[PDB]
Amino acid sequence: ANLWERFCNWVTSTDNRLYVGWFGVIMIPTLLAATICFVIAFIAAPPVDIDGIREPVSGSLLYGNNIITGAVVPSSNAIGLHFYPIWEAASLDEWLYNGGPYQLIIFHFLLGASCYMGRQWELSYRLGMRPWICVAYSAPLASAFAVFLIYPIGQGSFSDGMPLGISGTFNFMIVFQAEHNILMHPFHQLGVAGVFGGALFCAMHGSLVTSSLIRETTETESANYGYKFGQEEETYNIVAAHGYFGRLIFQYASFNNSRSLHFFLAAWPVVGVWFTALGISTMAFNLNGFNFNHSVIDAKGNVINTWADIINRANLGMEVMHERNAHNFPLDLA
Amino acid sequence: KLGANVGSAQGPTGLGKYLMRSPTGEIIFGGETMRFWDFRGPWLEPLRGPNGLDLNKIKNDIQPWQERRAAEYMTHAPLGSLNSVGGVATEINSVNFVSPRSWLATSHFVLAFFFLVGHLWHAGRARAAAAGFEKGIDRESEPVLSMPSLD
Amino acid sequence: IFGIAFSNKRWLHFFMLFVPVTGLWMSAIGVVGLALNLRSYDFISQEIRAAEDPEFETFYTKNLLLNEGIRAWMAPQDQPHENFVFPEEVLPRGNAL
Amino acid sequence: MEVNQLGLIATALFVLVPSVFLIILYVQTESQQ
């Protein structure tokens, strides 16, 4: 055939070891660029003026970090939400000082991860599968958008984006608690129920299916040799599993339908994580966790502290110390 | 009003405490609000000249109505709790306020997001149903079984 | 999509037990250490550099400033048996706030 | 950076000792009939 048709058949071929696809044509270059820039920055970038106060923070290994302290540092507060590609800088030296690598990385990554999600729909169509694995992936993806893009938009600066590093992530978390009382926000609470519950049901399901594996192997072999890839027959007895768990709790608290069970395993973490993504994306516009500071008052009007007041004291310590040379006026309004 | 020369007042970092330059030179407010220098509003524009905030105008022309507006807006910043306690998260109970801007932005981000999800759900479903595999894989015509191995 | 996949269903389900069970067990070991204040509190090399070099800053040194704030500001009300009185002048604070 | 002098040997043995254990076991599995 003609060259375009051949190219299209190759792009969309079900036979490539890794699927390419049309989402793939955007994903591949954008993830490669974000990856390469990230690796080089993390090793060798000089210090970055994150808070725009000429106080540059060292993120890279060669400039005194280790794996736990290192990071690619967010772009300068002087930039705010302005687009700062390489060609906006007078030189690579300036670009590095002002945190240009962060913006190149996060924009190429969010674009590429968005195409990763589309590529999941795309391959499922080519294989004749149902289409919703990409919906499950929208949960972690949404979370990535929240901390790298939506929170910056709300607060007016990429300098408030999550840093690309271990200790930077903890820094973002502690300041967020100071400024939003995230722990007292029900969507974060839904998030914790989602991940603690996803872990719990993960261990539960693994353990119940493992409990009920059909004997197919001798004592001197891993039971895993009892299952052969592609075999038609189920490898465990779900009725034995349900018999066990139904007695553990009570019968109607247990699933005997594998489809219903598996849908629940999908839904519970995906939904909780959609809520926690939305916690970050709505605290981005400063609708914050519950504030019960001084809610309990005695007959005279003395304040009777609750555990909410003690949280408040901790939050205050975070507040007054964070970005210790960056505030000149008495309220931290963003 | 207390006597400060706001143009020449160097803050702790070396940047101007009240006034500084944007990355393209324009005169802008200092402190963390450097990020917000693209802001434009009718209470502030009279102070702005071709080079940004105009120091002569700042020193001589700020009207009481501009002071009032600025104090009002500073004290109704769009920050508050889910139970409508106005202010920063460490604020005490007293002021029942959450900005309409926050309620409207948050609600609509939530709705836009779940609508994106609905778009993917229904678009993926429509594609599958048009092609005939929305209820699952035909056990006797499983397409992957007719494909060559990846390796 | 991802480059690798499960091919053995028994391994899959075992791994689902292994991952979150092992993680919780690791977290318990850390808290046994904390019983004794045997913390991963610091990186000594970071502290030596930062003490000698007042232009050296990392996210690690930043977080320690937050911790110092939490301890000073919370301890008096959180630990009432200590009868702490911390005059306003000794409290750690950055500029303005 | 004034790092601990045993950090290098500790990291190196931590990787190499169990890794070589696995390699030993893998190769002699492949060489079986």
Partner: peptide, 30 residues
């Protein structure tokens, strides 16, 4: 020494990814 060590471990992990993907044990349906 420390930087070389952290980069070396990382590089080994990236190499492991390449072998685990392209030199995997092929899934066999039979």
């Amino acid at each position: 020494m420390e930087t070389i060590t952290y980069v070396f471990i990382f590089a080994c992990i990236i190499a492991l990814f390449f072998f685990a993907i392209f030199f995997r044990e092929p899934p066999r349906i039979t």
